[PDB]
Amino acid sequence: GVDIRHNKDRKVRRKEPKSQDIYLRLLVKLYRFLARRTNSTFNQVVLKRLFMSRTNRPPLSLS
Amino acid sequence: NFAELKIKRLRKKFAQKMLRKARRKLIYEKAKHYHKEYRQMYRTEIRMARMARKAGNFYVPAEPKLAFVIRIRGINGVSPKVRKVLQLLRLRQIFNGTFVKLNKASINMLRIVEPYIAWGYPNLKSVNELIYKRGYGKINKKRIALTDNALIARSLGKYGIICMEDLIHEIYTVGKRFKEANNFLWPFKLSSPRGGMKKKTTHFVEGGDAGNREDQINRLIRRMN
Amino acid sequence: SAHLQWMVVRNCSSFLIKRNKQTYSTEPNNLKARNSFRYNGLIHRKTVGVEPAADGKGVVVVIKRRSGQRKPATSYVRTTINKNARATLSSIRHMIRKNKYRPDLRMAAIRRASAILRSQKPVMV
Amino acid sequence: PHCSRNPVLVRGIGRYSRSAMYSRKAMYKRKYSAAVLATVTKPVGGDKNGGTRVVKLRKMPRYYPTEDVPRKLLSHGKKPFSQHVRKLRASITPGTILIILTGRHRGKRVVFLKQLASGLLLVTGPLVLNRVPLRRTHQKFVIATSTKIDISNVKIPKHLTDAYFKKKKLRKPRHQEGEIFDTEKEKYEITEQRKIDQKAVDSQILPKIKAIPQLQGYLRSVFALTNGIYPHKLVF
RNA sequence: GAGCCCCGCGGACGCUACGCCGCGACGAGUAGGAGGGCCGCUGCGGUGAGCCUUGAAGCCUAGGGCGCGGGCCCGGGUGGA
RNA sequence: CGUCGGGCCCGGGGGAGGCCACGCGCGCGUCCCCCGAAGAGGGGGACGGCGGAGCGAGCGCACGGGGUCGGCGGCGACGUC
Ligand SMILES: [Mg+2]
Ligand SMILES: [Mg+2]
Ligand SMILES: [Mg+2]
Ligand SMILES: [Mg+2]
Ligand SMILES: [Mg+2]
Ligand SMILES: [Mg+2]
Ligand SMILES: [Mg+2]
Ligand SMILES: [Mg+2]
Ligand SMILES: [Mg+2]
């Protein structure tokens, strides 16, 4: 046997938008591929920024 | 311009082939030098003792800088301190052996978890058999079988460790990069000792197997792998 | 556009068929009759399809032309081929190889024409 | 076209190293720097059909199965049985007495001639003595005895390949529905070739065996087990 | 000091991207929590040029099978909307 | 004084075996030898990781990125498979 505390093995993070918004799914594909096939972490950050809830994507004021 | 692309591609292929055999020759000659060395300290550890005896005086050898550790107890009902120190030593399984550099701190560590482990000082041949038969490495935290030198140099190269004999030299002759190579190797998952071990509870000195044995670790390894 | 239609119809459609651990779809121009973006016969701006001829003999092939995207009446062109297996197969490979008309469904169409002509051929008892 | 110039002392290892090989084959001096048909054109066959027909071979298939299987990976080993190397048990030498264990001659004692190329054992007996003809047998299904007779200076005719002993089949030519059973060929005839070959090969071993005593009685017997002896304790 | 393939007209599958593929580690569990359920029942909006007196539901069955399982499909019979 | 000690076994010189994953030029260096008529200049050896300037192919054998045979035998309807 092995003594691994298996409670933390599964990291909880968004794999995809929880919505069913069709255009959202499309650009999720687009940027998933982009961040896969490019070395820019900007693409990765935007990709993961397409996933979280509206509460975690607060609206930006103009000012 | 098609023949131009073809000759360029042949250029690249020949360059890589040539580099490959240059590397192969490098590791070949490096292994030859390592063998010439390995003979040397053995011959010395013969001859200074020989010559001190001829002088009638004593020649103590140094305590070995390297030890091999194997765990001999399960995981049921383990005191938190022993459990933690074992997790430090990467001995998370039963029969889950790993190497260790020796010093006062490490020896005190071993004195803490005396009953749950069996250890000693392995020789060259045991190290070779162990590392060849059950050598697995941590690459991207994944246990990958050591089946190619390039797979080694992918991650151990930055310390100059390329061929497998470089690992062996770093290990047996505990060098500058011992910690990195040691942590790189996945802990060795081993069989159960063929023929039993005649006791598991008591310490090795009192007839059991818990604790330390200077050389019989090699007999235990042969019965082990 | 195409990818929209794919995702809007990918799991709800009159032609989609979900059954006991498989999925299929029955669009008129659906090569492989499988619910895929690549083999879908409706969303694609350029689409192929091979079906048995109206009578008991031959193979018809349907090509979606370019200009009539919004007019289904004249969006497709159908021509039936009533020659032997080899010449028809060569012709249909010629369609998509020389026209570059979605040169991915090539041997999918090849296989569908071959199977259609085989089924067409009478069965020995 | 010379030999390898390098004696294999153990498989995979050469008796000399790369530098010695360089010296022996002399690549110090021979160092070199640098350096159909798919379509047959048949005649016209006119007239007014001008233009010879370029007939292409390897015609495109007229049918393709609906699916296929991807090709296997490459194996780098596992050669076909035709060129498997043939191992011989050390206890087996031309002219020992063997004992049959599976075939319809269970327990018979036969004499052992050359080993066939396929690995099968080409053995025979004195048909006149034990009714065992020229017959192939497997080295794994016999027990080797220590009793050896010298069979040097005898001739084994060349036409004794495994192909010669290969079982012949007749059925079923141009018969699909089995209603008239083929009531012939069931009796495997012994063609005269086997007879003459058997006679010629035994004629030279009958007198040789007649020298040492009671070998006739030895070979006539059939091996068996009694409520006493046990095979492991026995010495063959 | 330009050879821009070709005697050929040729060339496996794939990619429901909520898909497919590769690698490693791991797999106990009451109370309790979560996910998936092409598990299941009843009714409604759509959809299957669905099924149905040449036999629906239902029930029976030493019949054949699938699914790890929830269960399901088909054979035979009875039955008659 | 001793070390089947080390110094890529520092080195050199010589004579009727083993080991080398040592073996294109030309030139440039580094070291060594000869005459050295300044112990100058030339003559030669050994080593080099040094220097503007393209490429072996052609067959096999396999302890080589997870098994194949280009091996074979017997039996078959009213009793068996
Ligand atoms: Mg376990
Ligand atoms: Mg748990
Ligand atoms: Mg206990
Ligand atoms: Mg035993
Ligand atoms: Mg206890
Ligand atoms: Mg569990
Ligand atoms: Mg019914
Ligand atoms: Mg020495
Ligand atoms: Mg020297």
Curated annotation (Swiss-Prot), chain A:
The chain holds residues 2 to 64 of 188 of the full protein. It comes from the Eukaryota. Component of the large ribosomal subunit. It comes from Homo sapiens. It is found in: Cytoplasm, Cytosol; Cytoplasm; Rough endoplasmic reticulum. This is Large ribosomal subunit protein eL18. Component of the large ribosomal subunit. The ribosome is a large ribonucleoprotein complex responsible for the synthesis of proteins in the cell. The keyword Ion transport does not apply. Coiled coil: none annotated. GO terms for molecular function: RNA binding; structural constituent of ribosome. One of its GO terms (biological process) is cytoplasmic translation. Its main location: cytoplasm. The lineage of its organism: Eukaryota, Metazoa, Chordata, Craniata, Vertebrata.
Swiss-Prot record, chain B:
GO terms for biological process: cytoplasmic translation; maturation of LSU-rRNA from tricistronic rRNA transcript (SSU-rRNA, 5.8S rRNA, LSU-rRNA); ribosomal large subunit biogenesis; rRNA processing; translation. It is found in: Cytoplasm. Residues 1-31 are annotated as: 4 X 12 AA tandem repeats. Keywords: Acetylation, Cytoplasm, Phosphoprotein, Repeat, Ribonucleoprotein, Ribosomal protein, RNA-binding. Its main location: cytoplasm. The modification N6-succinyllysine is found at K104. One of its GO terms (cellular component) is membrane. CDD domains: Ribosomal_L7_archeal_euk. The modification N6-acetyllysine is found at K101. This is Large ribosomal subunit protein uL30. It comes from Homo sapiens (Human). The lineage of its organism: Eukaryota, Metazoa, Chordata, Craniata, Vertebrata.
From Swiss-Prot, chain C:
Transmembrane segments: none annotated. Its main location: cytoplasm. GO terms for molecular function: RNA binding; structural constituent of ribosome. Keywords: Acetylation, Cytoplasm, Isopeptide bond, Phosphoprotein, Ribonucleoprotein, Ribosomal protein, Ubl conjugation. Belongs to the eukaryotic ribosomal protein eL28 family. Component of the large ribosomal subunit. This is Large ribosomal subunit protein eL28. It comes from Homo sapiens. The lineage of its organism: Eukaryota, Metazoa, Chordata, Craniata, Vertebrata. The gene is RPL28.
Curated annotation (Swiss-Prot), chain D:
The gene is RPL6. GO terms for cellular component: cytoplasm; cytoplasmic ribonucleoprotein granule; cytosol; cytosolic large ribosomal subunit; cytosolic ribosome; focal adhesion; membrane; nucleus. GO terms for biological process: cytoplasmic translation; regulation of DNA-templated transcription; translation. PROSITE patterns: RIBOSOMAL_L6E. Belongs to the eukaryotic ribosomal protein eL6 family. Gene3D superfamilies: 2.30.30.30. The modification N6-acetyllysine is found at K187. Its main location: cytoplasm. This is Large ribosomal subunit protein eL6. Component of the large ribosomal subunit. May bind IPO9 with low affinity. It is found in: Cytoplasm, Cytosol; Cytoplasm; Rough endoplasmic reticulum. The modification Phosphoserine is found at S75. InterPro entries: 60S_ribosomal_eL6, Rib_uL2_dom2, Ribosomal_eL6_CS, Ribosomal_eL6_KOW, Ribosomal_uL6_N, Translation_prot_SH3-like_sf. Keywords: Acetylation, Cytoplasm, Endoplasmic reticulum, Isopeptide bond, Phosphoprotein, Ribonucleoprotein, Ribosomal protein, Ubl conjugation. The modification N6-succinyllysine is found at K42, K155. Component of the large ribosomal subunit. The ribosome is a large ribonucleoprotein complex responsible for the synthesis of proteins in the cell. It comes from the Eukaryota. GO terms for molecular function: cadherin binding; DNA binding; RNA binding; structural constituent of ribosome. It holds the Pfam family Ribosomal_L6e.
